[PDB]
Amino acid sequence: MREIVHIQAGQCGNQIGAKFWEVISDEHGIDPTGSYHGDSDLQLERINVYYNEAAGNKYVPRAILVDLEPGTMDSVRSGPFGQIFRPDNFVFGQSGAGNNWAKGHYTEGAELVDSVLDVVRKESESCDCLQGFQLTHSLGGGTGSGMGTLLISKIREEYPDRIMNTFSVVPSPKVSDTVVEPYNATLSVHQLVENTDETYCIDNEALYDICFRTLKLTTPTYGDLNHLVSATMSGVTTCLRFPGQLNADLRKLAVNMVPFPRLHFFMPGFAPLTSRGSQQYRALTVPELTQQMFDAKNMMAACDPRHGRYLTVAAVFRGRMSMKEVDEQMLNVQNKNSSYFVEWIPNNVKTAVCDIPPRGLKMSATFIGNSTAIQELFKRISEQFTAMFRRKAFLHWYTGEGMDEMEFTEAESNMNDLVSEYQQYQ
Amino acid sequence: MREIVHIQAGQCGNQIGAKFWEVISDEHGIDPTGSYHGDSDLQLERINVYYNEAAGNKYVPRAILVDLEPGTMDSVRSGPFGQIFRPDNFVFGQSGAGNNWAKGHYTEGAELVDSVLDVVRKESESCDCLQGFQLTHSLGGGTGSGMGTLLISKIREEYPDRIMNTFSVVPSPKVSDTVVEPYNATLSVHQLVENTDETYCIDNEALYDICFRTLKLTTPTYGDLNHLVSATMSGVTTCLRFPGQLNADLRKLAVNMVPFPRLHFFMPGFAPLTSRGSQQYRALTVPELTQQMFDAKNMMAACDPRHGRYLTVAAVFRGRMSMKEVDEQMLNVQNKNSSYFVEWIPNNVKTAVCDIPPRGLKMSATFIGNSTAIQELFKRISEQFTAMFRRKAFLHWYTGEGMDEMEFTEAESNMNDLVSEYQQYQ
Amino acid sequence: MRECISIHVGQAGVQIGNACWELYCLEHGIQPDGQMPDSFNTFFSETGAGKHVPRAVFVDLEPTVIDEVRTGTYRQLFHPEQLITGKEDAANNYARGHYTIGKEIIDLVLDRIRKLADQCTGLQGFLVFHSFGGGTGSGFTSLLMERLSVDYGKKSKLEFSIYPAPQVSTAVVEPYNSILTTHTTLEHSDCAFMVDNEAIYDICRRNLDIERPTYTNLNRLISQIVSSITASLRFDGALNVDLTEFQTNLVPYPRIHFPLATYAPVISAEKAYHEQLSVAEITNACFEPANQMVKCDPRHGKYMACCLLYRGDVVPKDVNAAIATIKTKRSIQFVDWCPTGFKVGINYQPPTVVPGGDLAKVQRAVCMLSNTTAIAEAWARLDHKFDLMYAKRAFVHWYVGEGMEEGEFSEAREDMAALEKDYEEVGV
Amino acid sequence: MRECISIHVGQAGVQIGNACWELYCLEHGIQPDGQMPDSFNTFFSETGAGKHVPRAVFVDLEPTVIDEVRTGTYRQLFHPEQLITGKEDAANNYARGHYTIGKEIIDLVLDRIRKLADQCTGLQGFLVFHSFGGGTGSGFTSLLMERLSVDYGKKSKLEFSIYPAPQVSTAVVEPYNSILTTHTTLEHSDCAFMVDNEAIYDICRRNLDIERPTYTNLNRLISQIVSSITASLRFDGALNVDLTEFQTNLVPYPRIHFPLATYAPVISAEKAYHEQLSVAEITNACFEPANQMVKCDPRHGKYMACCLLYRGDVVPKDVNAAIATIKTKRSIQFVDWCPTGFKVGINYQPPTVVPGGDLAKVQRAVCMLSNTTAIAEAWARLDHKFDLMYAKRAFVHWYVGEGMEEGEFSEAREDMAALEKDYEEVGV
Ligand SMILES: Nc1nc2c(ncn2[C@@H]2O[C@H](COP(=O)(O)CP(=O)(O)OP(=O)(O)O)[C@@H](O)[C@H]2O)c(=O)[nH]1
Ligand SMILES: Nc1nc2c(ncn2[C@@H]2O[C@H](COP(=O)(O)CP(=O)(O)OP(=O)(O)O)[C@@H](O)[C@H]2O)c(=O)[nH]1
Ligand SMILES: Nc1nc2c(ncn2[C@@H]2O[C@H](COP(=O)(O)OP(=O)(O)OP(=O)(O)O)[C@@H](O)[C@H]2O)c(=O)[nH]1
Ligand SMILES: Nc1nc2c(ncn2[C@@H]2O[C@H](COP(=O)(O)OP(=O)(O)OP(=O)(O)O)[C@@H](O)[C@H]2O)c(=O)[nH]1
Ligand SMILES: [Mg+2]
């Protein structure tokens, strides 16, 4: 009961997905072969949420891997945990998208997509009651953004009543990796606005800051960064996988955190986060976790929560904890930091608690905030788009893939409207 | 009780027959010498359906091998299992037919045929209650098509009340092996229309697709292809050879699957079919088998079932299975895919179950569909015939063998009529 | 004295019969070889020392199903001459059953039956097990029924028939066979107990907690019903019911002889521990639509007569109480022309359970046989199914081939229409 | 005879119910397997030998909470058919509870309830455990209450409800759910006992010396109250109270059926040694605002009726003395239209304590149920909360999606306004 379908689109998305799978298999006591070697019966009770049971006491991720390039697939298959995936669930093209949203959405991606659709239909049929979909990808390139968006549109058309979740790695302001990133992000964000129910805005710059400042890590690799994201992902769906004292799944979270249809862009967070040295000089207690989570410098989106207000915040706690203590701490934070919370939604905080902690830790926390500061992310992007579009820079490539200028105009308008709406509800 | 007589005509037919025999001997625990070395008493209980018992605890196929060329016979005799066949049951000519239906039907084949007739009469006399005949051949050449057809006509004349089954390998559209294939197919199809009770339309292109796409096989040889066909053949008659929970033989299948006399052209299918790699990541269960069988890409005829409707479909299941589960799955498929089934024949599905699974597998399935999409196969052929015949191309050869133009006109008309009838009942 | 002859026709009939005979053996302490280490005489003849032989004939047009019996566990129980086998089947064709194939074997089976009947001194009648859908179960049975009616007539005829489902049908041509056999059925058999596999499946999943029931599970359940029916003859209870008595009570008009049965309790081993399965409880459960053996809504029909057959640790007073309670339930309506709609039997022997069976051992059980107008709904759907197919003459040629005439089909349809109309009229 | 059916709805309802059933078992000497190595019949059916089964139905739209019960310590106590589980939750949405998800499961639960009720010969009524804030606890319960009212009606209905706090709310949408369920609650349930988690927490920290109370600690305390209520039915005391009696005494007008409860003494193991916990003392402690189960000031309200339920080593004379003393306290005011505001019950059995519990074993205890105008304050704050959110239509779209109409919200608000006004009028 309550099966989730996982989709990974483009290189980054795939990489994050791999990490996610690795963590979750470890959590549920699943080895690199698909065999259960755990101790606790609780690890297998709700195994069906993320895994299909294959013949001969093995488990396989309900995961679809998508890319316009084959190399990524190979890299995944050769990775630790690569062999756990169903071979028929790898759907790859041969060409690539060349950082072009149009190639991913209209051309190469279009050709690819039917296969993917066929796979995912089968995966849906297999599951007794699919609660919904989780897509991991980025907005800045061509595949994850254009192809991903296309896929999402198709999915929603066939499953309009199911929950649609995306973990979207967004382009940061300073660390600009590509030149057409503004275009790709703009086009994809628009589509996300209409077709996702909740969007987790993850930002590389913020991750780097976390790694450098909070973990004090000498050399971050993408893997390390990805780990953080994976942890966050695991946090959200802990209530579907384990028992607890107060239980909240994907739907319950959405209903409590989304007051208006369009405002479904979250700034996620995780706690605790310490170095090796600073491990000894700390208190493993709920007050400390709470303190950590609400800090601006612990957000995985490059936005200052002190530049806006929280519309709603959901906190998900893992480990053996006193409910009273949890409640006290959340009330204290809202009373003390009154100015950071919208005053016309009393009790801006939703709490959920799962008894099963993550491995290595006795207590852990996951944060989901709907903050009006997310407007900053959109605004910058809009500005950059304007700067490009005013001089029609790089437009020709997109138009060569069948895209028309008017779409760009529309998307930009839409994003502007969204920004305005956030501002006004602040 | 209930003896079947096997006939193999022309090279392809012979080759398929060899494979068929090999599989069946293995199944019934019969070695290359004709001796029973099996374990189960169930393997010998109904051995007489396909084997005559010779002196000294040996078994011999009730098989007649026919060719206008002797080389094929030699090749068969030198094969693994070649020595099991009765030497007197090889009936061969010396000349060959040169891809000419007329040579096979009117001239060389005519001269040959009396011997064959004499053999088969004896084989009939030997058997206590012959249920009928199975002919394996192709429509595109001269021997299997012309000689085969001739043989069938003769047989039906002497056994008008017995069941007449053909496994006919049909010419595909793209992979055209010969130039006069259209002619040979047209002429033979006509004859089949009047003289066979059920015709299994097997297509090389579809087989290749199965091998390449579904089995992921690096290099298919004809042997591999033939194996698939053999499996299918074995499936149909499993109910005559073993016990079961619900039993259906050749007659029962025909009566349930043929609503109108002329509409007896089946698209057969088999399941399960997996690679070596994809063996581990699968569920050995009835739902999965069902899913596999009904897919368009698992049909051994190059026709899209989604281009027509199923008039009737017979499913034959082998292994220890729950009847309820089987029934649920078949009802689900018809309810979900309502549009692919003719609405004026309620319960378009017939089910049969045999307790004895094939070797190596715990569960297996054989599919027989009477689909209106088979019209495509006829239509293409008709078109090609027209294209040739309009310019009288290659006609002279046929006429030199005594054939008249009017026969061609007749056959073409007949086929057209058949096509029309299929279309209208769609 | 009091003896019942069992006839098992076609695959279904054979397989139900196997289960039945397994159950009977266990009930009377007869081993699979006929030896026992008295009432069992109602089902078995006794020959010499250390032998008892079932008063049964097994008939099939194929060898396959019967051949299993010959090879199997109960090979010594039946003598070879009571297992009758042809060479070719009816191939799901009524015509082949009734005419082409059936006319070759019917005489033989009749002769054997006569031989069997001559050995019995107090023949109660016949129990006939078959299906409506198969060529043998339909065509052969209709032929056999005619002959039996001619030869014996006044001796009672009972048929236990696997009716085809609305949704879950295994074969394509079922409606034709069903319609054809109904015509002769109405003419001949004196009371006919319809059952539906789909309903049984539902029961096994919901009440017995079995994910995947196979035919062996259905058959066992079916056998239980038969046991309840015949326990009044095979044991000595407080208050008893004979077959003639049953007929008198349960069949109000000659044509209206289709009472649908049901059993209670059908429960798991574990789920029995918590439930206090009282007489009142089981009785209440009997009159619930979910536990029915045929798919239909009694709430939309009216009861004409119900027979309640209790077995085991049951006392009359509490049965009476249960009946009274049932009377006062507005949602269970009986027709106005029958104010007293109960025949009640109580037998001392608890239901015995087959080792490795799905049913738990209980102190009490009940088999309700009720005649209700709601059964007409089944006929309506079947008729509808028939009419579609016949509109296109689909498959008809096959039947014609074996000597059937098109006019027969129409006649059969008419007969069924008339029957449905009759059912309509009695419920007003 | 005298029997009470318990219904446990949603997470909160389930978890309170677990505690309750743990307590009952210990009280009556029933082991977790249903075996006992008579009055317990009020809560348990008895089946065969060595078994007793709770007269309870556990309902949740998810599997998770109930699945714990199935796996856990008391898996053998309940039979599987009394534990009802859907597939998808109400997701903190009233609409999903009442309509979209609830309409799929309500029939089933009703049928089971009817089955349960048919086994009881002297039905007193129903105890319904839930919360006002959850989608299931609100939406499902309202639906269920309607159906129960229809089917039974005159049989008493009691609900034990976890009311949302003023400050410490765990969920965002609580006010909407609370308002919606209140409308149906007023229509149907006959008396409703509100409780607040915040108050319980305060009590546990201040009176029990627990730094960190978890839900298990609250639940245990809550169960005690229920035990006090039902001890008059489960034991034979000197002076007794039935549920109908309670209703008669405590509810002065049909709409004014919200009495807030409280328990005394709630003390630590050590702090019990020094205190001489007399009847007078505990009684005095009952009427103090700090020990209340709902956050509000009684000093600012008026009492309309109080029921005092004493248990253990208590004699009437000293209870009377205590009551007299309470009468003479000017700070505790009763409305002028009720000069005699006491119903008094005294039961012989001391409060039993759960091994590993927070409460010490005492010779005497009391449960006070009082109807007071001060409860109106809670409704005022809740209404205020509702009105803010609704001003912006925040979250409303979700409810609309599941078939709720905006007009319903307004109607509900109006109903609550009317209720508050009614409360105002009776205190004048
Ligand atoms: N947080 C992470 N960000 C990544 C990772 N890999 C890439 N990226 C970021 O994502 C962007 C590059 O995205 P992709 O390779 O996924 C573009 P994609 O293959 O989807 O389409 P193409 O344009 O066809 O290559 C860029 O901002 C990278 O800096 C990763 O492992 N973690
Ligand atoms: N599926 C298979 N198809 C085959 C096989 N061998 C040949 N064929 C196909 O059949 C056709 C060639 O047929 P044949 O050699 O049987 C013609 P035949 O000997 O019957 O008459 P002649 O004209 O006298 O040779 C052609 O379409 C081949 O591609 C086989 O082993 N399997
Ligand atoms: N209840 C039950 N029904 C069965 C069983 N086997 C077959 N059926 C039903 O019987 C019908 C098929 O008829 P069969 O008895 O197999 O056919 P037959 O009597 O052997 O007739 P032919 O094979 O056509 O000669 C279908 O409705 C099946 O669902 C069984 O073991 N139990
Ligand atoms: N006293 C007490 N209150 C609880 C407990 N668990 C949850 N709550 C309260 O119940 C309310 C939340 O409702 P739940 O019962 O969790 O929700 P639900 O009934 O399962 O409804 P959905 O999950 O939305 O379908 C909040 O006011 C919680 O504080 C518990 O064990 N004891
Ligand atoms: Mg890439």
Ligand SMILES: [Mg+2]
């Ligand atoms: Mg050749």
Ligand SMILES: [Mg+2]
């Ligand atoms: Mg049969």
Ligand SMILES: [Mg+2]
């Ligand atoms: Mg819940």
